[PDB]
A = this chain, B = another copy of it.
């Protein structure tokens, strides 16, 4: 039973110059210290966030995986890489380049390192083509952000994308990104603590309340990252609203709670009680170990929360290993 950690991120060796050729102001690149141990994601000439070797170096990453007890990691774009606001053809060329970097990263050891691709989701046609190209080149699926500006997952272009993926057997991880909140949540990591869980919840409900699960084939494999946000906990509020209000019930024929059999969530909720309630709502078959390696708010002892739960042995094995193996078809 190899521990599979199915939610982690990477960032490729791109220089200022290469990024500039796409967008001098908005294309992210990687600055590495002379020493080679630390670095920063840059945007234009500005420091975006500080980072360390494990995000760009697959050999260094292998050492930490050994140290952690992680046998297989699935890793994908850092969300600042998405480029969802750029011109389509440019975002397409970018996506391909990033996905190639991701394959080259995993080529260091394709047994223990699996990658998901990004897509120019602003353009449905180009997004489908990149999704297919990348999977047929080695990627085990796609990571998308959870919205495109004012477009949420109920949007016909995003629904059409999920449907293409269901049709071609391409798993999706939905990652919250580009957080709401306007001006309100600047200090103390509030976008991460408030807006992010709200974003993921909104993605799920957008699928549910629009009736989109009635249209998307049941074969779609889709996981919502970062514990599904606050979804599991406020689901009661949503069923209540659906039972008692026309406008809530209108596009959604079955109790919202019944739609949990249509998706997955990762396990990153940082609390025993939250995990227990997460597993209660979703069922043990629908929660997968994800850490958010190698960022600093990520689970520092990968799998620790699950292995130390008062869940059954049966269930623990599915969450740390079983489910993702099936979900991503990583042949154990």
**Cα A241 to Cα B197 with chains together (Å):** 14
Please tell me if A86 contacts chain B, counting CB pairs below 8 Å.
Answer: no
Chain A, range 234-281, C-beta contacts under 8 Å to B: 234-241, 244-245, 247-248, 250-252, 269-271, 273-274, 276-277, 280-281
CB distance from A241 to the nearest CB of B (A): 5
**Cα A252 to Cα B236 with chains together (Å):** 32
Contacts of A184 in B (CB 8 A): 147, 150, 152, 180, 202
Number of interface residues of A (CB under 8 A): 56
Contacts of A237 in B (CB 8 A): 193, 197, 269-271
Contacts of A236 in B (CB 8 A): 269-271, 273-274
Contacts of A251 in B (CB 8 A): 187-188
**Cα A182 to Cα B178 with chains together (Å):** 13
Q: From known contacts A188-B248, A230-B230, infer whether A205 and B182 are also in contact, taking CB-CB under 8 Å.
A: no
Query: A188, B247: Cβ atoms under 8 Å?
Result: yes
Please tell me if A300 contacts chain B, counting CB pairs below 8 Å.
Answer: yes
Contacts of A300 in B (CB 8 A): 244
Query: B270, A183: Cβ atoms under 8 Å?
Result: no
Query: B188, A270: Cβ atoms under 8 Å?
Result: no
**Cα A242 to Cα B234 with chains together (Å):** 24
**Cα A245 to Cα B190 with chains together (Å):** 12
**Cα A194 to Cα B234 with chains together (Å):** 8
Residue of B nearest to A242 (CB): B188
Query: A240, B270: Cβ atoms under 8 Å?
Result: yes
CB distance from A176 to the nearest CB of B (A): 12
**Cα A124 to Cα B296 with chains together (Å):** 40
Please tell me if A198 contacts chain B, counting CB pairs below 8 Å.
Answer: yes
Query: A202, B190: Cβ atoms under 8 Å?
Result: yes
**Cα A80 to Cα B150 with chains together (Å):** 26
Query: A194, B190: Cβ atoms under 8 Å?
Result: no
Residue of B nearest to A196 (CB): B237
Please tell me if A201 contacts chain B, counting CB pairs below 8 Å.
Answer: yes
Please tell me if A189 contacts chain B, counting CB pairs below 8 Å.
Answer: yes
Query: B194, A205: Cβ atoms under 8 Å?
Result: yes
30 contacts between A and B (CB under 8 A): A147-B184, A150-B182, A150-B184, A152-B184, A154-B187, A180-B180, A187-B209, A188-B209, A188-B210, A188-B247, A188-B250, A189-B247, A193-B201, A193-B238, A193-B241, A194-B234, A197-B230, A197-B237, A198-B198, A230-B233, A230-B234, A232-B233, A233-B277, A234-B274, A236-B270, A239-B270, A240-B270, A240-B297, A273-B280, A277-B277
Q: Which residues of A contact B (CB under 8 A)?
A: 147, 150, 152, 154, 180-185, 187-190, 192-195, 197-198, 201-202, 205-206, 209-210, 230, 232-241, 244-245, 247-248, 250-252, 269-271, 273-274, 276-277, 280-281, 296-297, 300
Q: Which 4 A-B pairs rank lowest in CB-CB distance, beginning with the nearest?
A: A236-B271, A236-B270, A233-B233, A188-B209
